[PDB]
Amino acid sequence: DGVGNASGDWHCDSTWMGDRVVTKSTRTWVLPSYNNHQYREIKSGSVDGSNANAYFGYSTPWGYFDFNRFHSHWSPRDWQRLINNYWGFRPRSLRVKIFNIQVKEVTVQDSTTTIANNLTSTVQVFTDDDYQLPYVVGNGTEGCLPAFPPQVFTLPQYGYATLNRDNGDNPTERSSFFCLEYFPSKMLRTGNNFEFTYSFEEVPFHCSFAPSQNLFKLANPLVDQYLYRFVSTSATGAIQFQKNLAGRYANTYKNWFPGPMGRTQGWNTSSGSSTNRVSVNNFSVSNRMNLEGASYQVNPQPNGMTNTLQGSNRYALENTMIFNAQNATPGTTSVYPEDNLLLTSESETQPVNRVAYNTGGQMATNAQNATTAPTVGTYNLQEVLPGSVWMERDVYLQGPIWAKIPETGAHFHPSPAMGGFGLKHPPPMMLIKNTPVPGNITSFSDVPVSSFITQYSTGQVTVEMEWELKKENSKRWNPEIQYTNNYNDPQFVDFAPDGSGEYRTTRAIGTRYLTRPL
Amino acid sequence: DGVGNASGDWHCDSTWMGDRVVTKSTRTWVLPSYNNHQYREIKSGSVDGSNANAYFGYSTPWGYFDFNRFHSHWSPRDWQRLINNYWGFRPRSLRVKIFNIQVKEVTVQDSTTTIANNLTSTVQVFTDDDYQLPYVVGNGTEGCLPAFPPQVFTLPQYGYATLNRDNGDNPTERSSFFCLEYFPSKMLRTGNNFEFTYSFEEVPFHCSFAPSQNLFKLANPLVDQYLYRFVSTSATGAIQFQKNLAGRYANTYKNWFPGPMGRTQGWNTSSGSSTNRVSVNNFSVSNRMNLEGASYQVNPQPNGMTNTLQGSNRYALENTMIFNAQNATPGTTSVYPEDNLLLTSESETQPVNRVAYNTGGQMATNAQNATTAPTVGTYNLQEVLPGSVWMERDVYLQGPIWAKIPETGAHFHPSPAMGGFGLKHPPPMMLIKNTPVPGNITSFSDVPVSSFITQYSTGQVTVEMEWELKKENSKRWNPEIQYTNNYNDPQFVDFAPDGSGEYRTTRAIGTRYLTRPL
Amino acid sequence: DGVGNASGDWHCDSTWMGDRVVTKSTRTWVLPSYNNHQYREIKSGSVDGSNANAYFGYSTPWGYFDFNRFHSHWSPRDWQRLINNYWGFRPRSLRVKIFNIQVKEVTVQDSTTTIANNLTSTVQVFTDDDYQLPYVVGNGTEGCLPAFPPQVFTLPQYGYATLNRDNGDNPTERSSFFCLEYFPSKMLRTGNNFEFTYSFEEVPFHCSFAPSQNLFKLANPLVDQYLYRFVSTSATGAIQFQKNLAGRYANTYKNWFPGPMGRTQGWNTSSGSSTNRVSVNNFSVSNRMNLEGASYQVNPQPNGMTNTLQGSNRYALENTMIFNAQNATPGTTSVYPEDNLLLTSESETQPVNRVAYNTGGQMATNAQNATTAPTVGTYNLQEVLPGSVWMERDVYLQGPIWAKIPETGAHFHPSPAMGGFGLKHPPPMMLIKNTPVPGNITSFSDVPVSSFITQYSTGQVTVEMEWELKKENSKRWNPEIQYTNNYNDPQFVDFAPDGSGEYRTTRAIGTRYLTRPL
């Protein structure tokens, strides 16, 4: 439209309206010129002594928008206002918009950089609606709209790993190359704006409630069962039985079973550091799966377990999600202690899921004769059994919203190990890059031009989601537990900028606070 | 209708029409008089030293039509034209028709056989629409319309095993006898024709595409994760963490897991014969399940694995489908080398399923103290876990189309271990027999007549199926892999008759050629 | 319909109606069971010392109907009545019909054959409408409806050669196998009949007239030309000219040129046998073309030449069509003298085409200086030049009607070297075979049945063509030449059966009798 006329406004709010809440977030982004407008074949061999780190892929000159973290849509006070009052929620719509673009031309002429703004330069933008490109948004990768609205962020570079050969850095005949210029983009100059809308498929609500009943204590503790149980054998080998009394839950007949489990190791946090074994490189002793002759660590393991038992300091670290209070810089290989790290705890599920560092149970190892005695054998892993129930991992303010389910054809219970909603058709990926502008060419050459003017672009992005809520209707009498701002001797305010202007976040707020009778 | 007037024509073609293809095949069959028009109680005791080979059942005087193999509807050139251009397909309809029947009366009088044609003899035909009879069509049994149209085939005899007692050849009180004359058939003389139509329930498409991304390399290899991971313990027992860098897929947090697995043994094909252990009777060392006190080999194991790792000669033979190039005769107990055998390979799934001869992974065996060190224990079998994905076995031109799901009431993921579509109500079984004509009886006898005129029948059968296709829409740039007629120094043409007139087929054409970004 | 009711009548006549003539011919055929209902891969290596005789192909169990010879539609008296009165003709329609079928079952039981007729057996019939099969009808092959209506004929076996490798009997990766059962046929029992109609594309008339003017004598022989011609050089090197007088056709300026030519060798017929060189194996000294490293004799050479010069006994045998008076048996490798052979002569074209055993002309070999003298060099081959005219080979009563033009994409002047009409879509091929009836099978076997009852079929075929004629309108005064029954001391009547009942034909009647002023 016009140079001296704004393309859009800054909308950033929330609007609770009964069983729906619409959130809105605007942010300023900056897009570098990655790979000097080229495609490069990136590849790696086995690093760290693990050929699972060996890949082969392509880095493109595009950047993408990632809105896959909760704190990109919710403020800490609107999150709290949700987890204290509702039993669940699920996304219903999405509507992204890019506007107020500005392309800047950088020039380092004379060992001195001068930033002037180009008014005729464009920016390319397209959304992958049919899922024809490798999805990279739902894998816990950095680069999402910052948590704090004032913060400006750089868009991350697009790239993807494709099939490599024999755990090496070479390709196979099936390795594919996707050209992103082969998609119909839209071009934008300073006066234009891009819009895009989407609507989620039905997905089941997330359950933001914790159970207030043990799964193996569902029976009435006053009435006895009309069922008997084999208790022992007499001297005559004759089998004897005994009735299941009331309150004796160790012996009652059950109807439902806890869910899957896979033992991990447990490590004690600070308080008990003394107990933990000294100097142990976990890699060698971690839970790992093999895929094509390579060993990959499967953190955070499949759903159906609790990393900790409420009341203890021991932790199943490989079944845990570990974030970082203070954001970090790319390429950091520094070793950090637990202090500035937010170890999430899923213990409000202990009533239904099993601890990840204990044996799942015991079963029989043989057959008793007039000779051999009955023997039991504890097991460390048990998968899904018919009639089992479990609770899924919880979502955090600083955690991921959705994940894309791989379209292989067959899958069981599509719920991402990192929490969130599993989707067959998740929000499209929105790529963007700066259309290249050639330097001073002066003669023909069937060779492509490699001299480009260095540029970068800035702009705003507004993303407005709509969520559906599930009202809590409990007849609990006494008061419940809520998420509260409980600090002692505060030297700073949490979820707010400190003296220098850097945003602080010392807590990981989850979602399971309210309760429900199993 | 009439003797000197044909009941139907010979339709045999294919007709591609966008997202649908209709195939049609006609063939000539011959029906012997099995069991001299009687029902016999067939039974066997433990043979080969395995009481699992002990059964009890009934052989009937009926024969049936089996269209449960792909190469009964597709030519090698129409198969190829499908697997190179589509991402999947599924059957939509069926329409069988029997016509141009001819009953012949054989007579060996005077040590010399004279074949004359009986014009008044009938043939009985009925389709089991309610699934009231034991289904025997989807179990990989011979007897299907030949691959080559010119070939004439004999219909196989119907029979079934019912409950036997204590792994013996005796019946139980629950053993059932089904009388097939107790169904309303239709009778046909030379001028009549039988028709029958059917339509499949919705079934999910088969996925004829291979993934072009590893399941554990879905993250962007340029951006790092905002998650940390327990890496080791300090001398103070204090736990230390480290950030998940980019491209280090051995350590990233994953969202999805590979599918089920059950270790089988792996044997090296020719090239590596030297490595294989010498003289091993597999039975004793094979994967077996127990059902009622008997050990059965479970080949080809459940879905979710790859029999081989692309680039190697090693094979998980018990997880493999093994066909035969040159068709064989009934009762052959000869030992064959790999040469004339088509060992199918499911490696275009290696990116998502695990190899069947490697350990599935490692997990923890204990709990580390200030005393005990962390220990891991490799596992050989792991079943379905929540959030796992796998790809189903592929279909072959020479393999089965569908299978009937047992109507027990409870089942998980109904997909036949041998590939194809699992159906609750599969195409009805079509039985047929020659109505008996008595010899010269001359006096009453309350005893049934046992003297019959020997006869046989011939005729044509046309089966026309309709399939639905799933168009491929990929934005891959470089060229894909296709199924091509790549032979070197051909001494004969494949998929064509040789000097003597015998049909040759040296390859097993599968379905997974195209690719898709996971 | 019915057994005791005829399917069709015997129509065999001609009906002249102005500018159209409709011919009709019925005949009785017999169809053997070729290849015992099988497909065989036929192949040959280099035979006769020529690797051009090495092929690789397939013989099928089908037979076909061939109506590609003129004497299958015309009687000698209706042919004569055409070539004496019209200036040309061309086919307009076609309409074949098969009826009154009868399948017979042969039995050699007891060293004694008994032919009984099977009333339930069928016969399969289909026409290749889209030209998807190798066409073999227009290559001068035997097997066409006999010349004489009373004669019964056996249908010839279908087969075709496909690509062979390096002039050997092995196939290439491109060698194709066509299954004829893969086409939708129609089945016929004794009471049924098959019909089929077709209409030719526009094709230019054949020109059944000879020119009555030399191509180089078109000018008026009374008037002189206003053009001069370089005649010589004076002693001064000065060039001199002279006017083109009247009647001096050796020197006139011409406007049109004779057509293509390629010198062959000329051999004298009987009268001059003495002159011919003694004992010469032509193969080594014949006109041959090379295609893929093999030498093939190109008889009868391309159009545009006359095999003989009217008034001489010399013959360009390789540019000649040689038929046989008395029909012969298959596999005869006997050497025959000219006597019972009909050597066609194309001399009524000598006014426009050049003799095939003379040098085509002379041209210049150098450049004359004050030193070198002018030299000429006779040429033996000259192809098409702009502004050239020629006349095509003539058609004979015993010769072919049409030919199919290969669908390569590029071609020049599509007129078959053997005469007739070149067609892009010629009359479809009509294949037919006896549906197989199995012997006494008694047990299942996944192996195809190989025991068949020996049968053969008989029936009638009526083919009715419509032709368009071009009326002659000449203002010639004196009488023309006609084809007349001019024999002297006839010991038998020509074109009629002799004492034994064998049809005689001592002449090859062509088509060029009438004349036209060039």
Side-chain angles (χ1 to χ4, degrees), chain B residues 228-451:
Chain B
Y228 292 52
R229 67 153 193 303
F230 169 61
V231 308
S232 64
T233 287
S234 64
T236 64
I239 56 182
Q240 299 166 164
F241 307 77
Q242 193 158 45
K243 192 182 177 185
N244 292 330
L245 304 177
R248 317 301 219 62
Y249 294 112
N251 307 323
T252 60
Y253 274 36
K254 308 297 189 304
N255 237 19
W256 312 104
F257 304 98
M261 76 99 39
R263 199 179 193 182
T264 73
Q265 176 76 12
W267 300 89
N268 293 352
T269 51
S270 303
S271 64
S273 301
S274 60
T275 301
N276 294 344
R277 159 155 219 79
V278 295
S279 288
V280 296
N281 163 25
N282 189 40
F283 193 55
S284 58
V285 293
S286 52
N287 297 16
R288 285 186 305 183
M289 283 190 181
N290 302 340
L291 203 62
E292 312 182 16
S295 289
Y296 305 72
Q297 284 186 295
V298 287
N299 292 38
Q301 319 299 313
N303 292 319
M305 288 174 284
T306 172
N307 54 65
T308 46
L309 193 163
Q310 182 60 294
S312 59
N313 47 307
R314 176 152 292 232
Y315 262 96
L317 295 171
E318 312 187 297
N319 188 69
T320 309
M321 291 280 280
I322 306 172
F323 305 86
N324 192 34
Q326 283 195 354
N327 186 69
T329 59
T332 180
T333 64
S334 186
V335 174
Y336 300 125
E338 175 198 349
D339 315 13
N340 64 34
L341 285 180
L342 324 175
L343 310 181
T344 68
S345 182
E346 316 268 337
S347 63
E348 56 266 335
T349 63
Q350 70 181 4
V352 180
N353 300 358
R354 320 189 223 183
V355 197
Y357 52 80
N358 291 307
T359 63
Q362 57 180 1
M363 305 206 69
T365 55
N366 73 327
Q368 110 290 319
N369 295 305
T371 297
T372 63
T375 315
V376 289
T378 45
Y379 55 85
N380 300 299
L381 58 162
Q382 183 183 75
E383 305 76 16
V384 173
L385 279 170
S388 62
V389 301
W390 65 91
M391 279 223 296
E392 308 282 35
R393 182 175 308 272
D394 197 11
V395 303
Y396 293 85
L397 189 51
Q398 32 270 147
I401 306 191
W402 63 76
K404 185 196 160 55
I405 307 171
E407 64 211 321
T408 48
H411 60 267
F412 172 59
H413 214 89
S415 285
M418 285 189 270
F421 308 76
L423 304 165
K424 172 180 173 56
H425 301 104
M429 263 210 297
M430 187 174 303
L431 289 297
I432 180 169
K433 79 160 186 177
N434 304 306
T435 293
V437 176
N440 178 188
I441 304 304
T442 64
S443 53
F444 178 78
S445 171
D446 198 46
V447 175
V449 311
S450 53
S451 182

Side-chain angles (χ1 to χ4, degrees), chain C residues 294-438:
Chain C
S295 289
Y296 305 72
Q297 284 186 295
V298 287
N299 292 38
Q301 319 299 313
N303 292 319
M305 288 174 284
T306 172
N307 54 65
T308 46
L309 193 163
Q310 182 60 294
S312 59
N313 47 307
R314 176 152 292 232
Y315 262 96
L317 295 171
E318 312 187 297
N319 188 69
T320 309
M321 291 280 280
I322 306 172
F323 305 86
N324 192 34
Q326 283 195 354
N327 186 69
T329 59
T332 180
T333 64
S334 186
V335 174
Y336 300 125
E338 175 198 349
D339 315 13
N340 64 34
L341 285 180
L342 324 175
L343 310 181
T344 68
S345 182
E346 316 268 337
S347 63
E348 56 266 335
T349 63
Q350 70 181 4
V352 180
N353 300 358
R354 320 189 223 183
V355 197
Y357 52 80
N358 291 307
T359 63
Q362 57 180 1
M363 305 206 69
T365 55
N366 73 327
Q368 110 290 319
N369 295 305
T371 297
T372 63
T375 315
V376 289
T378 45
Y379 55 85
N380 300 299
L381 58 162
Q382 183 183 75
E383 305 76 16
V384 173
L385 279 170
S388 62
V389 301
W390 65 91
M391 279 223 296
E392 308 282 35
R393 182 175 308 272
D394 197 11
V395 303
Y396 293 85
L397 189 51
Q398 32 270 147
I401 306 191
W402 63 76
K404 185 196 160 55
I405 307 171
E407 64 211 321
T408 48
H411 60 267
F412 172 59
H413 214 89
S415 285
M418 285 189 270
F421 308 76
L423 304 165
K424 172 180 173 56
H425 301 104
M429 263 210 297
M430 187 174 303
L431 289 297
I432 180 169
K433 80 160 186 177
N434 304 306
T435 293
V437 176

Side-chain angles (χ1 to χ4, degrees), chain A residues 115-194:
Chain A
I115 302 175
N117 70 71
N118 203 315
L119 297 166
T120 41
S121 295
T122 50
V123 63
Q124 266 171 285
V125 194
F126 79 96
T127 57
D128 189 51
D129 302 300
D130 295 310
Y131 311 100
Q132 287 155 305
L133 289 165
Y135 207 75
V136 296
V137 182
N139 297 288
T141 54
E142 294 178 348
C144 309
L145 280 51
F148 196 39
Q151 305 185 307
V152 173
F153 73 112
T154 84
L155 299 189
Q157 182 176 15
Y158 186 69
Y160 58 80
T162 182
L163 303 176
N164 59 304
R165 187 162 50 65
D166 67 68
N167 305 122
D169 61 302
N170 299 293
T172 67
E173 309 167 7
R174 290 174 175 287
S175 299
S176 65
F177 169 61
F178 297 91
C179 186
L180 283 80
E181 272 79 336
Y182 205 54
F183 289 76
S185 313
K186 187 198 287 183
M187 302 192 100
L188 314 179
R189 270 180 174 175
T190 61
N192 308 130
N193 64 34
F194 175 71

Side-chain angles (χ1 to χ4, degrees), chain B residues 41 65 71 165 237 297 316 321 356 370 411 512:
Chain B
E41 159 188 294
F65 286 104
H71 69 194
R165 187 162 50 65
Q297 284 186 295
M321 291 280 280
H411 60 267
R512 246 90 90 148

Side-chain angles (χ1 to χ4, degrees), chain B residues 128-203:
Chain B
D128 189 51
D129 302 300
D130 295 310
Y131 311 100
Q132 287 155 305
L133 289 165
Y135 207 75
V136 296
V137 182
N139 297 288
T141 54
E142 294 178 348
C144 309
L145 280 51
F148 196 39
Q151 305 185 307
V152 173
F153 73 112
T154 84
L155 299 190
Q157 182 176 15
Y158 186 69
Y160 58 80
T162 182
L163 303 176
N164 59 304
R165 187 162 50 65
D166 67 68
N167 305 122
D169 61 302
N170 299 293
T172 67
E173 309 167 7
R174 290 174 175 287
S175 299
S176 65
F177 169 61
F178 297 91
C179 186
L180 283 80
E181 272 79 336
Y182 205 54
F183 289 76
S185 313
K186 187 198 287 183
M187 302 192 100
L188 314 179
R189 270 180 174 175
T190 60
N192 308 130
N193 64 34
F194 175 71
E195 180 82 55
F196 161 63
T197 189
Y198 168 82
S199 62
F200 300 72
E201 54 221 20
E202 297 306 335
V203 54

